Curated annotation (Swiss-Prot), chain B:
Source taxonomy: Eukaryota, Metazoa, Chordata, Craniata, Vertebrata
One biological process term in Gene Ontology: negative regulation of T cell receptor signaling pathway
Shown residues in whole-protein numbering: 394 to 658 of 661
Record's subunit section: Homodimer or homooligomer. Interacts with CBL. Part of a complex containing CBL and activated EGFR. Interacts with ubiquitin and with mono-ubiquitinated proteins. Interacts with dynamin.
Expression across tissues: Highest expression of UBASH3A in tissues belonging to the immune system, including spleen, peripheral blood leukocytes, thymus and bone marrow.
Cellular compartments annotated: Cytoplasm; Nucleus
Record organism: Homo sapiens
Residue ranges of the region described as Phosphatase-like: 2-260
Function as written in the Swiss-Prot or TrEMBL entry: Interferes with CBL-mediated down-regulation and degradation of receptor-type tyrosine kinases. Promotes accumulation of activated target receptors, such as T-cell receptors, EGFR and PDGFRB, on the cell surface. Exhibits negligible protein tyrosine phosphatase activity at neutral pH. May act as a dominant-negative regulator of UBASH3B-dependent dephosphorylation. May inhibit dynamin-dependent endocytic pathways by functionally sequestering dynamin via its SH3 domain.
Major localization listed first in the record, in broad terms: cytoplasm
Official protein name in the record: Ubiquitin-associated and SH3 domain-containing protein A
Keyword terms: Cytoplasm, Nucleus, SH3 domain
Amino acid sequence: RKSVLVVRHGERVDQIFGKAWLQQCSTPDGKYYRPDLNFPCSLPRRSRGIKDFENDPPLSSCGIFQSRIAGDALLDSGIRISSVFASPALRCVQTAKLILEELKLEKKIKIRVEPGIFEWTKWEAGKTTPTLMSLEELKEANFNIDTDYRPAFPLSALMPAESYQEYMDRCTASMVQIVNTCPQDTGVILIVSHGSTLDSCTRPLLGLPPRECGDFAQLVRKIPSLGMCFCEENKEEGKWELVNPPVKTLTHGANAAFNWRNWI
Amino acid sequence: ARKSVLVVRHGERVDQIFGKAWLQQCSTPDGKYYRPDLNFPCSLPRRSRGIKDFENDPPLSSCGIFQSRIAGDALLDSGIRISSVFASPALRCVQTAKLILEELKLEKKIKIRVEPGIFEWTKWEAGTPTLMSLEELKEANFNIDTDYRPAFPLSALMPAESYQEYMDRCTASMVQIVNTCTGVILIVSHGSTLDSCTRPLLGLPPRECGDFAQLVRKIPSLGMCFCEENKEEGKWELVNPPVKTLTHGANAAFNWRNWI
């Protein structure tokens, strides 16, 4: 039974360590270090050193954990993943890769990067698209990217401070392209993206117009890291329906910092 | 390269997230284990007597496993040498100790010395407490040191002990711990342990209870306290822990039916 599984990326470092996270993990000469264990072990190599990560931040160590444990659960559920699409955000592509590794499909399935499902530009740093990693850079960072895939949109088409309606229209238009890419295929089309994507990419499949922005927003507030929305196609009736996701929720506590000097 | 004591708090325990009846949420009517949420661990430890006893001796959450692993991973990088390992008999502590050892690649080399004397203050537990026996731990694939004679046995832990009575058995245990066997002694235990087991090393008397408790509130999962021995001066001193802090956010449950 053909289906689409939309998945929110794992915890992003700047969610915890704030908008200036990069300044906390950078030396004067622009080199990386971990001031806290939730900063990732390393950062992949990128053109202008590590400058361009500032608004395209990686997963935290926790976000890696979340991604891995969800992927492990997807393996155990037994469902078949036929393809994987991803927002060009590094956090989303990183989440895609970690899931594929746990499924043992990292070498068999390439990631199709689709700038058309990038986050609503109203919710980004400068109310605009940041510098993202090139596909050449992702290959060099050992991501198995599908360079033959012709995406619905280039990143440059994404308007800064686009309206709610414009954001929904480009996600809808992207979901036309996504479904038509290998249409015979049954199996799960995995889409690893942002919170908003759970609604923006499933609505058009269900034959529904966008929600009122308010209701959309309230619904997105509640999507946790690696939250999922699952839609199955009923082939006979030519119709899609929302379904219980193939894995359970993931619920855990925070962990605060401590200052050892307090003991003195 | 001095002698030292690294005290580490266990990772996230499942019941801190899923409450006191966590066992009833992951148990079938006929007593088999299932995972209602992914933060419940992959499995409970192989125990033959059944799952009933875990209720008040809860294991690490998935997050707790992650926390333990990433902490142990960083200890390996720091390049310090762990020579022995002591652990509170609570499963969560022993589990954290195994996970750290695995990351240090010493799970086969160093046996875990279970010391009931550094168990949690019994005023902060349910009510003797219902733990896994050393044979049950061995059975569950834990590399325990059965030869070890502990300063305190499981039976000695009486309910509703006083603050002072808890401090006394911790200092008493630290006397022993120091004598048994110049690498790092690892103590994987509870939040309270970071203070209760380091004060006597430094030669300090117990804190006032309130000062103690106020300090224990602030100790996160995998939190550490590190004392180095100055052999020349015959004195111990607190030192910056060998690995960094671990700060991360929470994750809430979502209900997919909200989308319909």
